[PDB]
């Protein structure tokens, strides 16, 4: 039906594909600014950056444009003064017409299986709060909402105010 | 005054009295497991899955133990699918004796600088919703409420049901 399997630098093009097309069906919106050159040289080059897992049909349900890529999850390893190492879940996103033959959740239990292995205490990830039904989804998986829970905000400061602090 | 610089693998059980210490000033009940031993394979061995700055003062070593580390920053790197790699700021501390000398602002610009360096298009960090200081603090400062102006919160599933997942 479809194999969930850790990305190559082959799957770039198909990653930005499906970032381009998560950045659609998200509302926030705001373009893609990264490049297939991005993913490659932060993905597979000296340090990884992010981890990508990717959702792949046989060459009987390809997509009508031809691809084999249907979906994907972005991770990374970040860490907690308390507990050390944990798993965060950047996004994942499944292709419409996919989305129904639970490539998705195969996703969770590989992620799931990544956090076992590689010692991570838990898996942080974000949830929009309008989001009702993913949010009761990962209630069922027992996920705590932590911004509730402990009032946590999330806040950046972007290329121009980080300029002025560092000169 | 002092010295803000990154830290070594000597710092690392420094670095660790310093976080049993931010422990205590938490008002959350959070023991800490983390070990100098994990410090250290975590921080400097092969691949380091955090980075640390610490604020070092001159024979002003506190009293008593005699430390000349009075403060640290631990940050990491993380990834946006759409502008790429960011600096992500997990915490920050100056032991209570130190702070209002301004090292909490000063950490703040090396930060900057690292994300500078290191081709980051933003910092990120969570802040209390009841701190109203250092909202305050960071807003002026530039920044911007991601929870309040898109609604994100954050979520967490723990070992336990990572398992079942992983398993089941």
Not at 27 to 42: A, F, G, N
Request: proline letters at 4%; glycine letters at 6%; aromatic letters at 14%.
């Amino acid at each position: 039906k479809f194999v969930i399997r850790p990305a190559t630098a082959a799957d770039c093009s198909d990653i930005l594909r499906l970032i381009k097309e998560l950045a659609k069906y998200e509302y926030m919106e705001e373009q893609v600014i990264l490049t297939e050159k991005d993913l490659l040289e932060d993905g597979f080059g000296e340090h990884p950056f992010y981890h990508c897992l990717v959702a792949e049909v046989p060459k009987e349900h390809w997509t009508p444009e031809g691809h084999s890529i249907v979906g994907f999850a972005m991770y990374y390893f970040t860490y907690d003064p308390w507990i050390g190492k944990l798993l965060y879940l950047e996004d994942f996103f499944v292709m419409s017409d996919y989305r129904g033959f639970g490539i998705g959740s195969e996703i969770l239990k590989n992620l799931s299986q990544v956090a076992m292995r590689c010692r991570c205490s838990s898996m942080h990830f974000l949830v929009a709060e309008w989001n009702e039904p993913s949010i009761n989804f990962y209630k069922r998986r027992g996920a705590s909402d932590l911004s509730s829970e402990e009032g946590w905000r999330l806040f950046k400061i972007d290329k121009e105010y980080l300029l002025k602090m560092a000169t």
